[PDB]
Amino acid sequence: AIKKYKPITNGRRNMTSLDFAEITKTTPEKSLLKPLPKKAGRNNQGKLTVRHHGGGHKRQYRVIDFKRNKDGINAKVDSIQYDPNRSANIALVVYADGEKRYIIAPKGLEVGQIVESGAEADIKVGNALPLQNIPVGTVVHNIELKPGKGGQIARSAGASAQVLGKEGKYVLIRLRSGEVRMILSTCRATIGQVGNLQHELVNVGKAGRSRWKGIRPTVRGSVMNPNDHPHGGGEGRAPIGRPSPMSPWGKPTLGKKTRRGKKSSDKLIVRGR
Amino acid sequence: VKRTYQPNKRKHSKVHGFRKRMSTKNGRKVLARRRRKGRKVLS
Amino acid sequence: EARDILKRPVITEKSSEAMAEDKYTFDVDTRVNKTQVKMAVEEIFNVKVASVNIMNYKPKKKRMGRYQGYTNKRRKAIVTLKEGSIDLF
RNA sequence: UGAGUAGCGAAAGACGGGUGAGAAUCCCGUCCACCGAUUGACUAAGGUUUCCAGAGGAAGGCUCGUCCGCUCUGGGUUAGUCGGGUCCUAAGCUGAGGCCGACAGGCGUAGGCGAUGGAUAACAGGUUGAUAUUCCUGUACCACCUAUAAUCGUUUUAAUCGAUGGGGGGACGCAGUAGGAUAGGCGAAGCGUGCGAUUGGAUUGCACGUCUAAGCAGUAAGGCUGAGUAUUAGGCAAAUCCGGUACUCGUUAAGGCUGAGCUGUGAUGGGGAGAAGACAUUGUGUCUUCGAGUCGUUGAUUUCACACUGCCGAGAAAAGCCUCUAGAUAGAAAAUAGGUGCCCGUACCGCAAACCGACACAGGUAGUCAAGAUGAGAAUUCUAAGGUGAGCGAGCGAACUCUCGUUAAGGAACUCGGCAAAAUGACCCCGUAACUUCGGGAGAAGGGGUGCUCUUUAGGGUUAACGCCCAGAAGAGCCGCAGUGAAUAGGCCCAAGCGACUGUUUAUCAAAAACACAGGUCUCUGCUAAACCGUAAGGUGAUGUAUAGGGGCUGACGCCUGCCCGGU
RNA sequence: CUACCCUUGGUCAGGUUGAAGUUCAGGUAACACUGAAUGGAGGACCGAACCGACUUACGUUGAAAAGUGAGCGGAUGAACU
């Protein structure tokens, strides 16, 4: 899974990478591609509103079926492919009527395997079902919050959640974060865990590789000036020098909770992370 | 040493030209001011 | 409108050499096209026009005393006759 | 006033002959010198007439001026095919209705605009003072139109057109070698053309040339690719097209798609080192005829070609194009002949005296081409093609300042400090320590060799061979102070502090131990996420979803990170 | 002009080192493993173009309102344009 580079240079020293053995086709499905120009963290006013985004390799977008709403028709896993837009890999599947779609690639999905969706689908990896029909204790991913909107939860590499119980209109689920919350039982989920489990272990190794990923450098608050940052100024190095560490925009940033009050989901959230 | 002014017909027109001036309320105010003063060149 | 399309003939050394080659040079209305020039020539001089080349000349800076200005811009056509001849004199 | 003072802005000129009122400074000539990965040839921006011819010499020109990018007068830019428009879309801009907002107005859907990218039919020669793929000559190609048409159709059609729809295609990264070609280079007792030395010698001696496009027809190094037939929960309807599926045959083949180049033709034409005739008030000023095109070798940074192989960071769009139907309608056209084909740019400068720098300014300015000797090379030195001698000079050869060379004995005694300088420097061979994260340290260090002649002799590429090219080994000799004989080309070592490292920074006194960094950790955030911009709408986050996103601190890696929650 | 960014293009003589992987041979009960060859990695190495700006001399009513000479760093990349 993980390949460790030899220290031929100080740049490569301690660097690692995925071996991409899971990938079975190295080019994408042409008809499922769309252009994805970079925003570099700049909004519709043309202003930088999120720091540290910019540059990086050009990417095409792969249209991904998060909805899994094509029910009662088998689809055969043509290939597992790399996708630059997300940590998970993606499986190109071919339905029995000849329509082709990308899905998040679950752990253990193999080329030639069959997947299905709907209330009658079997409980096996890659099948999509309403939480109504998914048994208690099952590990799932790509979970909807609103029926028919498409999966929004547990889509990263290695992500999964566990079905815990079934109230009347809602099913209890334990999310990767540890939160236990209710989700409408008409919402769908895909059986299994998202694949590419070694993603998090990669040692990026050098600054340039982050740059290829489109991440620009993070300048620490303490090495700016007072007009730049609450931590700026001071002669020589200085400690934080106030009761709490502060964000660049002057808000406390260590332990201060920011979840807004009076949210609709607060009565659905059973146990915080 | 590279100097500040690097002329470019397209840039000059698109930034300071007649249609750019006309496309904004304040640009139209620029034109009105220059006409009032009696400028030969409005844009 | 042919008499408006054609303004005057051009008489220069280069134009005289062209005339030796059966090419007649005219200053024409700055708004007309090559086709209009051909049709005007055929209407006015009862010739058959083989082809028309055309070109524009920018206003040229010109001085007289302390007054600076420009000459008129010009549109100059060179009409190659297929049949016939034109006597400008 | 300073004062006839500082300065006259990187440089090599000399003389002869002209011209003129006047000449170091203008013109012509000879010789000399300078650049030549260029000071040469193109060209995009930018400038906008500075271009050409004739005339001038007030002012401008750092001197002069008979001259000029100056002044006067008159001229000069030619396109169906080159670049742009009548084609396409990217970022971005704009935006009917719409959403938002005291006003002003902001945002935004459909739709438009918008090259720096996609598509797209012409080449060679000749010609002027000034334009030329634009004019002329020759020979093409593209779209459209008209007439005549071998032939096919004639209303469910079936000849033909065909979507504003479907599908295919266009269509793409980075690196790495290998190969086929071609351009270009080089050689030749192949051929052609000149010349044949007076300074001692030679006369198979010396010098020069040794080509020709698009188009059309054929061919083919290489690259890629199974094909056929049935059927159909999909491609908003349909589909014979695409996708899916099943079967038959096939699979180091055949067929299909691509493809540099080559051959012929184009072309008894053009060009051509040159020769012979002439004409001419003297004529380098022009007319007619004639004039060779070979073989070998080398060989691309061009092309086949993002082809092939490998890789992770996973690499535009839309149209042109092809195809499918839904639809349309009696008519369609292989060929032949004739015809039609607009607008804009086109001059000139363009590593510069014409652009940006107030200057005829030692700066800055994207891209293309770029020969010989040497060499690994686009380095180095000298040359070619081509261009240039720099818009003040003449003397003198003081101090002093600058730039350069050398230096007895000594050799860091200088100095804040070896600052500067000196030394090292190429290629081959021998040889090379602690330490180490096992990669390194390393070109460690420290040594040896290097020219020329001749003899003998293992090879490799290309060829029937000869021949051409590459490339060693051994021995014997010769010369100098010295053989990478010039130029270009690391000084090395032992230790300590700091930062892991490659990077980044105070444009214009600080390049660092500062920033960043990969790694660590804390913390927020369940998605209309948190954070951020905005009054809002609308956005970034993210077409992401806790292996994710924001913020704080720490800063590779190794070993570790103790006690205190009273205060905030 | 300059900072960052967006889309779309361009450029980087020549030489060197030799990661992973693979094949062959050996080796093993089988693997480890060893050697050779192959292979062509890298914010890798030397060095022009190009980018930069460490030292120093010169210049300081400059040739230049930041330059020039000689050395200097990077030069397939977080490159330059």
Ligand SMILES: [Mg+2]
């Ligand atoms: Mg950040």
Ligand SMILES: [Mg+2]
């Ligand atoms: Mg600071």
Ligand SMILES: [Mg+2]
């Ligand atoms: Mg403050």
Ligand SMILES: [Mg+2]
């Ligand atoms: Mg402080």
Ligand SMILES: [Mg+2]
């Ligand atoms: Mg302190």
Ligand SMILES: [Mg+2]
């Ligand atoms: Mg024209």
Ligand SMILES: [Mg+2]
């Ligand atoms: Mg005096």
Ligand SMILES: [Mg+2]
């Ligand atoms: Mg004095």
Ligand SMILES: [Mg+2]
């Ligand atoms: Mg004096």
Ligand SMILES: [Mg+2]
């Ligand atoms: Mg003086």
Ligand SMILES: [Mg+2]
């Ligand atoms: Mg001078």
Ligand SMILES: [Mg+2]
């Ligand atoms: Mg002139």
Ligand SMILES: [Mg+2]
């Ligand atoms: Mg004078």
Ligand SMILES: [Mg+2]
């Ligand atoms: Mg409106």
Ligand SMILES: [Mg+2]
């Ligand atoms: Mg273009």
Ligand SMILES: [Mg+2]
């Ligand atoms: Mg010319």
